[PDB]
Symmetry: D2
Subunit: 334 residues, 4 copies
């Protein structure tokens, strides 16, 4: 890979973006910042993964650097992002993955240390938002701070694009049945801002608010105000599913929907939007790099204008690979 | 607390209908048939329950009878339902809970042994179907074989009744996020007729078919052909949730929906349809006897005619208590 | 008449000690300190519990106080325990349940605010340690700061006392198969001090170190240096089990072990050490208030001097009730 | 010159023995019998696996045969094993994996249809039993029906061999914390012979009896009568762990035990007995083909003669690979 990348935060998104970068070879990770995880612990956290298995390659600590597949990575331990010397480490792009510096003002602190561009691996209240395969062609070299939206927006937007382009979405309501995440608790504990999210993750189906369907309206401006939804967190370690109930303007028989989604999966959205007619379940998408995989057998139509469409997503690996693809696309435009 | 009842099958539904009968005191269990579970094992299965806790009372085997709280229950071990001597044991109504004698022809075999009425604790292809609080007033003494529909139909129908009575449901699509059931497998195993249902229940979100939303059109005839849906089985031991996405005829602001559902929960549907504004999760409904509990905070409206309504249900205890309530209602009409 | 109690920390132990105090009525909770959980959130966390169900009585926020069953409780939000005004609230005993002030020096900070005695609801490196039914008669009025040991020590010590008193333990090695706890992570995350404990709790069996078996040697001085062990954390929300493999001095047939444990459970250790011959599983002990329940059917003897003994414990409810029992015992000695 | 194999049963062991056979290339599967799983369903069950992921080769149904990586496999659907035409399909060795024909009389039914040898992939009450790396050199050409013991015996026997050879095991007691299996139930259900095994697998820690430690005494005659144990089934989909508490004749410092086990893992037991000092958890052994992996950091010594040794095993893939290794060894002796 050609662009040199720095990763802020070695949490689940930071580690899996690093794993995707080395597995795909599309970008070169040269620096990682994390003030709470030391070098020897980073080796362990990167090498072993309960969900995705052992890293396929070599990882070791050598001379104060994390060396992955022979590539040395400078390690920083700064709490203040404006103090990270990204430029001295050669990091041109920075993936801001901590989840706490998501505004352009906060993510822009990485420019002080010499980074040229910042990619927020989460929704942002004000940064331009992108979804690969949907609006990445709207990216240009003047944008120094951008967001790759969320894993759920990356699942819904490619499907919504195909459905809207062929039949027109009059309105839609989404539910995502989502795997557990790092912000949840093992047993009933404090969450403060989101009380239901503090309840034991192993024991419960937990309703949760999500701006993912509304965010599709920013990535596909014609759907602004036409979509909203919510989520249920369930006790699975990984892989989630979107359930889009929509009204269509043009009549669409279910076989016509299958035809256009299959055609999009084989052409312009290949590798982004998948298509299957197999009797799949969530574990079949573990470590799958697609953003969205349409499940033809799981959906149901009430009539030609009112349908429920189902799409699977590995909420960890699909999204992490899209962060890398977005950076590779950005690098090709330099 | 008067009608004498026989229970065919000591599976999950049979045992919890028996527990609901002794806890509510509305009906008297006098006989149980199960050809595969012997008396000493019935004591154990009834006394200890992983989901609902130990039985609060006494359970013993004495002189070939199952004795619960000092009440002796005759135990039969017949494979052929037409050979069960219900009349001789004093059982007036029989709960057909095995899941394999759901047609009126098959469930009618209990009349040969002297039962007066049969309540199929499952959907039936041809028996009259009832949901307490929705169409139980249509029951008449002439009906000897009836069905109490499924746990999911009992959750959706009370909510759909209130919404349709106040705003009119033009069309709706339902998703149920359902707890695991006895027909699922611990690890990937054979299912044959439903391939996805054989996949490991602890590891997967599994899409599944349900006739529950279509069945609401039989208990609420005005909704015939206007509702359908599907399910996702998730790894929780009990408690499920319905997500109804519907198009309304009259405009309904979300606060107007909350007001009419709250009013119904405090009046004609008290004890059947619940209402909450608390930050609840699924475990909060464990052993809850309501058929449906509207979650005001979890639902979302796109506009005044297109909304997503959420309702919780203890798929084991709500349904089992409704079987007892249906029999008590039937007894009051004799 | 009842001692007035303050609880420092409204985490899992703090809330369940508060619940055990109201359920048993043995002590009066008058104050709670927690700098991270505000009053409205305390109402929610106390009222709903995924593991133990909804609180039986009433819970509400009124005039800045937490009102449980009509009893108002003063709420403090201090990070420094020496600044908590326990005396202004009338709190005589303080339960130090945060897990971070476990030395006599740190727990003693509560005496500055007017508390008379402090009970550390966790192991302490230097405070006198007690296990109800084993050494609580060694408590005296001169001890202002004491520890109630851990949930695991309270399970092992009553059983080890009976076995050692009757047959003599030459040596023993313990394994506890433990339910998940609040210190674990939902998905692979940072733990720093204990790397295995950061691994996803829902996906893994995790080995862990524990000083519980060694601590039994401090509560039963004759067993000092004769016991040690380790733990496996497994994905269950609650209820744990001890597996004690010990070498006995006097020969003990397995029926002789059952006889002495049953006799102890019916006499001096009634309510502390339970005994069962039923085919129990972990969920059968959910919300069980015993410290230890000997499982006669699960254990196995290789010979008369080498046996494996099994004992269940609700790691949340047994221990929380023992904290209340220890305070009631202390109050009776004033 | 590879042996042609028939597999009776396409359950968990049958499918993973087939997968190990194609992955290792040590034998050629030419036939599979299963009366309950038809050809199209076998394609699906083999292709998708919740635990071990998708089969990365090719699988399809063609002309009534199951074709894996271009190799056609004859499919039989016989309930009676004496009616399976193994000889017509060219199957020389038959893996009897149903768990229902484990005596030499029942497993010998495969000789009627033309098989030359039968390998029971489970313990047998009377067939000669083997563990690769421990007693496979005792196999000879006169043995037509043999057993590969259980996954647990294959974990304990290699470790017990090394410990006994170097220090002498005076006596030992084993506990296995075992992942869930196909014989368990998703929710509390019937298991007439083993009541605890019917209890909900997702909710419980379930004690269970196992003859695995006693079976080590048949494979290592010098340990006959010196070992026994029990199991706890816990809610993990795969990977189990053995906890051997043993008294040693020669003094053994824990570092001496580590040295001896590490040396065995690098020499005569390479690929059978693993050794690690890493901070591993169960998911780190998912799809690991070792029979046993000694966890140096998890074990604990009370003194030089009384220790607790921990060893991990992928109860599905380690055992399935040993069945293939045993057949490859048998074939080399023809």
């Amino acid at each position: 890979g050609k662009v040199k990348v720095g990763v802020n935060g070695f949490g689940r998104i930071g580690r899996l973006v690093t794993r995707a970068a080395f597995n795909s070879g599309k970008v070169d990770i040269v620096a990682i910042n994390d003030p709470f995880i030391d070098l020897n612990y980073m080796v362990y956290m990167f090498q072993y993964d309960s969900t995705h298995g052992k890293f396929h390659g070599t990882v070791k600590a050598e001379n104060g650097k994390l060396v992955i597949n022979g590539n040395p990575i400078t390690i920083f331990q700064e709490r203040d992002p404006s103090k990270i010397k990204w430029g001295d480490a050669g990091a041109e792009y920075v993936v801001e993955s901590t989840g706490v510096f998501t505004t352009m003002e906060k993510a822009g602190a990485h420019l002080q240390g010499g980074a040229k561009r910042v990619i927020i691996s989460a929704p942002s209240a004000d940064a331009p938002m992108f979804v690969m395969g949907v609006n990445h062609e709207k990216y240009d070299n003047s944008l120094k701070i951008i967001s790759n939206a969320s894993c759920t927006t990356n699942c819904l937007a490619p499907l919504a694009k195909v459905i809207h382009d062929n039949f027109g979405i009059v309105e839609g309501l989404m539910t995502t049945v989502h795997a557990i995440t790092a912000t949840q608790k093992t047993v009933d504990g404090p969450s403060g801002k989101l009380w239901r999210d503090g309840r034991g993750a192993l024991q419960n189906i937990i309703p949760a608010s999500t701006g993912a369907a509304k965010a599709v309206g920013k990535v596909i401006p014609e759907l602004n105000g036409k979509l909203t939804g919510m989520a249920f967190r369930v006790p699975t370690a990984n892989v989630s599913v979107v359930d889009l109930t929509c009204r269509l303007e043009k009549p669409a028989k279910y076989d016509d929907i299958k035809k256009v989604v299959k055609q999009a999966s084989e052409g312009p959205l290949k590798g982004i939007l998948g298509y299957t007619e197999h009797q799949v379940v969530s574990s079949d998408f573990n470590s799958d790099t697609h953003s969205s995989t349409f499940d033809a057998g799981a959906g149901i139509a009430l009539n030609d204008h009112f349908v429920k469409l189902i799409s699977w997503y590995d909420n960890e690996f699909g999204y992490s690979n899209r962060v890398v693809d977005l950076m590779a696309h950005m690098a090709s435009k330099e």
